[PDB]
Design a protein around this ligand. Sequence first.
Ligand code: CA
Ligand code: CA
Ligand code: CA
Ligand code: CA
Ligand code: ZN
Length: 316
Amino acid sequence: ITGTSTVGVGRGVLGDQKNINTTYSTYYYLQDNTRGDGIFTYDAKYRTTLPGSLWADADNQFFASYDAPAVDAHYYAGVTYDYYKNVHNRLSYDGNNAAIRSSVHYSQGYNNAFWNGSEMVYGDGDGQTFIPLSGGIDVVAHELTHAVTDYTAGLIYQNESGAINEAISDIFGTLVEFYANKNPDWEIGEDVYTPGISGDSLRSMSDPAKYGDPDHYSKRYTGTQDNGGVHINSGIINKAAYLISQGGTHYGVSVVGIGRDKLGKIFYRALTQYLTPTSNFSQLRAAAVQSATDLYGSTSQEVASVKQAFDAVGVK
Ligand SMILES: [Ca+2]
Ligand SMILES: [Ca+2]
Ligand SMILES: [Ca+2]
Ligand SMILES: [Ca+2]
Ligand SMILES: [Zn+2]
């Protein structure tokens, strides 16, 4: 919509107060004109017809419980935008400042969030397994990273390339959580998962096996469920990325950690320069090695650490 850029205030899903960039034209809309060609948040009104209505508010105050998921979708979209721009010099997900659109209140008790090819979509959860999914910065950044992958490597969402596609989203979702720096960790979705249970999440990058996911290639899932295990076998790559960043000894193989910033550089470069739609795990290892070599040199610690991390998870 055409109007003036304004600044609203509200509460997110977890009760935290924050400012949001809005647009004024009769109503105050969730439209942030300060990043690229806009970040736009919509209300799906418990339906599944998308995108729904551009979120409109009478007073620019967003403190109703109904407002909370839209406050977070909008705000965390802006944080993720800032991360890709400031850290990777990437302008929005297509690299050309495409508008970022998100819809919240999708369906009823919908325990999930997803990129549909064109926009972000968040359920409210059923209140037991999930609260509104946009309350998790790692969930928002995970899903927006699928948009990034779709415009770059284009990793097919099945089998090994699919598990890489998932891992890449867990990695950058986690690096975005660290960038925002509020209670960061190496698990996925903990802020919005199971309000009655402390300390759990959907997945762990530091210990995939915590939730039944493989942490070594010899444990890969080779069946047909979950598109050949895209959310299962990502544990292998998640563990390798965790090792590259943090270090550790995993099945007897020692890895020297190089830190989060370098992990982010190596994997962003692999994603955007080397990976293709059909890349398998072994080809990811070669892309990450070639990335680390471009960035730090072939004799570098960074290159040696990438090789050790992939050895540790059984990927040759
Ligand atoms: Ca209001
Ligand atoms: Ca966290
Ligand atoms: Ca997390
Ligand atoms: Ca929980
Ligand atoms: Zn995903």
